[PDB]
Structures are given as structure tokens and as C-alpha cells.
Symmetry: D2
Subunit: 229 residues, 4 copies
């Protein structure tokens, strides 16, 4: 058996165990700022990602084992105008050598790819439901499952995501501690069929392609654990 | 700081770190059977509870600190008839010397008491909403918050409950891995004002007061962690 | 499988998960003072013990499994005169209902009993080697194995004890961080043959039977973990 | 605060979170074989190293914090002739981009370098004590502290190493579960002055420079944890 685990109550401004991609950076105060901010205001056409340095062993072909993992993180999405926002933030697993994909609605993850993601989508694209949503995505920008999500501008969101290998169940929940509101969605996901044996895990986010569709995507903390046995 | 933690993948038929109360027992196969079963069938007028042996330090008056805790458990409620069921199961915190309260709709927790509970209610009493629900209860059998809960007869339910002291937020989620369905509810709960500094944590359950309102309440596993700092 | 774990960076003056026996108490500053102190000076004829509230499942007859456990703790033994000291402190496992045994050289553990202990002996009795020692004791005040121990008056000692079930090896080490000095001893110990399936773990200590053989026995912190699988 | 942790009960033959350097490889049966073996026999002039993929944050200049860490591992050194052996195995911390250094007595770590190591030396070089020893090395192949070590050919050794930042104490212990024999050594080590803020941790080993001074250096398991707060 193999157990892997880490916790950040904040991020180091010069992170060494975090692989920063695109526009992502850590602020002096220790906030993982995925998308660009200038003069304290979010900028459009931004894409940032952040992955944990050590690959995670999610399934083994020789031993026919699949990992179970659980992760918590808090995140803020703040937009100058509440009615106009894009695009969103996601937690994702992809091959270790994963690089940023397309911007805008593709969230830095997909294009037109072996990526499984839990997205917090703030803009309705062609492949989306009408309302903002939390989605479970399996190798597509189109979610297999989603729940409508009443996004609260600038309010801290607490996320908990778990994968139970014995039942192939991935579950994601978001709670706003400010008004004790919550949402949850689950899906049946076969990690062996969606991903390679080893992955890197982390976050991706992208601001809108227009000036009037901008917002921040900041991660405040992050704890993760995975066991393969 | 103080950290307390434990995990059970199953229960020992003669549990020594579990304080069994009322009808509760552990089966040969390691299932925490809270309410009575005879010839493999549930019996009415049953009340069972189970608490972890070591008290949990949830708040300290001298140091003005409050604990944050997280727990996972799976549980099955199986009734012979899907339309007629009572009463339910809960995870709860109460003073260390807590003893069983009233049966039936009171779930072994309340009467007519310092208990905070997350209930999975299967019967609509005077103080309930119409539908079966997951409730957050603060010193009352009446929930301060609840979510409608589509109970699945005999199907394993995976529960995750967390309390974040810095935001007084208690969140509870239930997922059925069989059809990837989930529910969640949150509430603002001040543990300092609801409970004493030290508590015992565990489960309580009660079958209905009539023969045609019977069901099992079995816990399959349980992991818990709490930190006071 | 079953995992049990706890950590104290200090102790609560009114401990609820600690069963205090004999003279043991927790000071305002959070120090587990096993033996009596008056006007800041140690008193003779004192015996104190402290156990964790939840029993530990160390072996299971039905499943033929034995637990592996690891514990860390720091402790100070301070005597007014460096040449005259008695008796010592130990970490021990005993049946859950264990009560204080004899005082003086018997360390509150033994008499003339199912107890396994790692002792830090400060006085040479009939059954001892000449020098102060760290001993591994299996149902006797006489150690099966020991190492000579250069006790440092008033200096913090860091202890690490591990039991590896697959090789029946119990290992104990003491280090004084003040001058980077260490000692270690191991023994082959069959827990199934020495102890019952369930035990309580903790510390015991006793000051000498004479006024000129007095010393403190204070525990500053304690972390413990055990897995049965 | 930041916590990092991992456990291996065995190694994956194609390790993805392990950076293999030099001759190091993982056998089919999951043994980290640091130095070369042909036809089941050790070969001379071999050097192998293995590091965990994610850097470890051991000290922070801005926050004046230093990490405390603890690690366990088992290892076998087997030589065809008990009287003729070289050179040894070590657990070490070095800059993230660390590469193999010199072979033979330099253990793959040093030359003639920012590396702190706990070595299990099997050959007496110019800079060594006479007997085989466990050494604590701080930026030199010459140990600042050591303890004589009765190496047992082919017998599993259980190692426990801890660093306590608050007292700058690094402690290392070796136990042979086969005959319940142990050794320990400690040293005062300032990690801030010896190493950079971020390091990679792992093992290095080297077989002798002659045919009659060959031995294996195999690691069987490994668990590690570090907290910066
Ligand atoms: Ca979208
Ligand atoms: Ca009800
Ligand atoms: Ca003695
Ligand atoms: Ca040497
Ligand atoms: Mn979407
Ligand atoms: Mn109700
Ligand atoms: Mn003795
Ligand atoms: Mn050497």
C-alpha cells in the first residue's frame, strides 16, 4: 500500500512543491491567485493552473487496485459585476506532464485529453446548462453530472471532494459558511478507464474572453490524501 | 493543541472502545446494529445508541478555543415495506454521561437536553417537515435546518459531516453510491452555547412504535477526527 | 482494521480523556505531574498514574491479529540532590480496569499482574542492575532487557517507543536534546501472551520511600497511535 | 502551516513519485535496490540514489520557521563475505536538484556540497572511526557524531530518524528485530545553516571499489512526515 498526503493552510509565495502554470502565482499574503489581477482588479483572457509536485498513483494495472482519495479546499471568485462573469475554476486530475489547454470556457483543461475535473462554472457556454453549476467532467468540457450553483460573489466557498474506489463514486460539495448554504453532486467515474495509472492533481481557472466578463479565482488552502491498497 | 482520531472499517463484536446503550449490538460480521432484529427482521419499540469511549474536547473556556471535527460513516436503513417506516438514525454529540432519552420520534436523543445531532429521519412527526429529511438539530427534536432526503431502502449511504469552528458551520452530506445521488445541508451552530466543553460522540436510532413501522439502522464503518487549537 | 490515535502538546488542567490515578494531576501550565509536589518541591511516598480514556485493541483471538503501535512523549525528572533519587517513571499497558499497585520500587505497576512497561528507573533495588536504567518489563518489576541510562537532572527527555507486531519487537529510546545524548533498548515481547486483548495505556511514577530520595516525574506532551489489521 | 507525508509498504517497480538516480531500481517484488545486482549477487563500483518527488519545505527565511520531521524505513545490507564489505547506505536531505556525487567511500553524497545525512557505513575510510558505524553528517563525509554499529549480514534493520526543530536535535536509531538489538545516535544540527529552504529527501548507497568488497543495499519500506509551522 501507498499513502500520499499534504496540507496547506496557506501557500508560500515561492512555492516549491506547487507547479505553477500560465498566469498562476502566490500572493505575498499566501493566496493562490490562478488568474491575473492588476491594480487589485481581475483581467480578461487569463488562464492559470497549479499542480502538486508529486504524482499520485491512482490505479495499478499489475495489481488491479484503484485509489480512493479525499480533498478539501476553500476558494473565492470575485467579480466587479455580479450578473456578468466568466469562466470558472476546477479541481482536476491529469497525466503528470499535463500542460494548459484552451482558455475561456475550456477552463484551461480541455480543447476543441485525459482529465477528470470538478468544475465551478460561472458562464453558460454551448455545452452548459443555463445556470451556473458545479459539474463532474470526464474527459470532456461537457459535464456528465451537475448541480445548479448559486454563486456568491466574493464569499469563501468550502469544497470537499471524495472518490470511493470500491463504488467508483466521485462526490463534490460546496458550502458558503457565510450563510450556511450548500450544494452537492455525485457521479459514477471509472478512473482506470478515464486516466493513466499516475496523475498530477491541482486546480485550473480562466477569466472571460471579454472585459465585462472578468473575475478572480483564488484558492486559500488545500489538503489532500490518497491511498492505493 | 489536542488531536483525537479513530477509524473502524468494521466493528468488533465485543467492542471495548464503543459504549453500547439500549438495544445496540455488533453482529458477528461486524455491523453496528443499533435497533433490534429478530429472525433477520426489524422489531418495533427499539432504541439503541453507541458512543466512542474517549470524550472529545470541543471547547475550552479558559483558552477561548473551539474544536473543528470531521467524520465519515456508512449506514443502511432497511424496511420490509418502503412506504411505512420509522423512525431514523442520527450522529450526535452530548455530555459524556449521556444516557438514552425517549424512543420513537425522539430518536433516543431528546424528550418532552444538551445534544447536537445530524438526523436521518424516516417518519414525519408533528415537529417535522412532510418528507423524509436530513436535519441539523440543536438541543431540540425540531431541526433548525433540513434537506429533503430520498431514502433508498437497503442501500448503503455514505455520510460526511464537518464542523469548521472559525465559521461555526456544521455541514452534513449523504450519498448513495448505488445511483450516485446526493444531498447536503448546513447550519450555523455555536458549540460553546449548545454543549459543554467535553462531549461524547456517536449514533442513536429508534424503530417505530408500531409493527407496520419497522426498519433496521445499521452502521458499517466510522472514522472521526477532532482538533482543538 | 482499526486505527486509534491522539496527540497532546500539553495537558488540560481538568483532563477528561485522561484517567488520573493516585497523586497524579495536571498543573495550571499543563504539565502532567505524576508525583506530589509541595511548595515546588517533590514529596516522598507518592504514586501517580495517568491512562488514556479509550481502551486500545492490541490483539484479537478470533482474527489472530496483533496491533503495532508507536508513541512519543517528553518527561522531566528533577531531584534536589543528584546522587540520591527514587524511584522512577514508566509508560505501560495493562488491563482496562487497572488500578495502582505498589509504591516505591514497584513504580505503581507491580506487586509482591498483567502489565508491560518501559521504565526509567532512578533507584537500584534488589531486582535491578547497579546503574540507573531504561528497562523493558513483561509482567515483572524485573526487566528482561535494559540499558544503562545517564539520567540528567531536570533536563527534558524525549522518548520514542514502537512495537512491531510482525516481529514481536518492542523498542524504546531516550534522547536529551540539551546535549544530544541518547540511549536505546529492545526486546522480543509477545503481547498476546503477556496481556489481554484490550488494554489501557499511560504512565506511572513513584517517589522514594524516604525524604532524601525524592524527585518529580512530569510528562510534558504525548502522542500515540495504534493499528490492528 | 504545511504538512507533507507519505508511506510505502513496498515500492512500485516503475515508481513515479520516486526519482531514481544512478544504478537504483525497484525489483519486481517491490524492493528498492540501490546498488547493482547481477545473477542475484552484488557488483562493485555501483552507486544508486532515490528521492521523493515533492520537495520538502524545511525552513522559511521570511517567517523564521524550521520544520520538524520523522521517518521510518527498513533496509538490508547483504555481503557474500561478512569480513569484507563496502561501502554503505544513507538517508539524506539535499537541494532539490541534487545529483549523484562520488562513489565508493563518498556514498554518492559527497566529494573531494549541501547535504545532511544519516549514514550506515560498512567500511573504514581515512575519515572514519575503526568500526562500522551509524553517523550523522553535516556537509561532510566525516561524521560529527557516530555510534559503533554491529552490522548483521542480511538481517532486516528498522530505522527511525527524527528532527525536532525547537531543539535542533537530529536522532537516528537502528534495530535488528531478529535479535532485538539496537543502536542510537544524536546530534545538534542547524538545518537553516546547513541546507537551503527547500530540499529533496531519500537514500543513497555505494558498493565497494573492489570485487572483494561488495554488498547489497536494499530498502524495503519507507514512511516520512514533515510539518512547517
Ligand atoms: Ca462554462
Ligand atoms: Ca421524525
Ligand atoms: Ca528501581
Ligand atoms: Ca566509510
Ligand atoms: Mn460547465
Ligand atoms: Mn426530523
Ligand atoms: Mn528497574
Ligand atoms: Mn563514515
Amino acid at each position: 500500500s501507498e499513502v500520499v498526503s499534504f496540507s496547506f493552510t496557506k501557500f508560500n509565495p515561492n512555492p516549491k512543491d506547487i507547479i505553477l502554470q500560465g498566469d498562476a502565482l502566490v500572493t505575498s499574503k499566501g493566496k493562490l491567485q490562478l488568474t491575473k489581477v492588476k491594480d487589485g482588479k481581475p483581467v480578461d483572457h487569463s488562464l492559470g493552473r497549479a499542480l502538486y509536485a508529486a504524482p499520485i498513483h491512482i490505479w495499478d494495472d499489475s495489481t488491479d487496485r484503484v485509489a480512493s482519495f479525499a480533498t478539501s479546499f476553500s476558494f473565492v471568485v470575485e467579480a466587479p459585476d455580479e450578473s456578468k462573469t466568466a469562466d470558472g475554476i476546477a479541481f482536476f486530475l491529469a497525466p503528470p506532464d499535463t500542460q494548459p489547454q484552451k482558455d475561456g470556457g475550456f477552463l484551461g483543461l480541455f480543447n476543441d485529453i485525459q482529465t477528470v475535473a470538478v468544475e465551478f462554472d460561472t458562464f453558460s457556454n454551448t455545452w452548459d446548462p443555463s445556470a451556473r453549476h458545479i459539474g463532474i467532467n470526464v474527459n470532456s468540457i461537457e459535464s456528465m453530472k451537475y448541480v445548479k450553483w448559486g454563486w456568491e460573489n466574493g464569499k469563501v466557498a468550502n469544497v470537499y471532494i471524495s472518490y470511493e474506489a470500491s463504488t467508483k463514486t466521485l462526490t463534490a460539495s460546496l458550502t458558503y459558511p457565510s450563510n450556511a448554504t450548500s450544494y452537492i453532486v455525485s457521479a459514477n467515474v471509472d478512473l482506470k478507464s478515464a486516466l493513466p495509472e499516475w496523475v498530477r492533481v491541482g486546480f485550473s481557472a480562466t477569466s472571460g474572453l471579454s472585459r465585462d466578463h472578468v473575475e478572480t479565482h483564488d484558492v486559500l488552502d488545500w489538503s489532500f490524501t490518497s491511498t492505493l491498497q
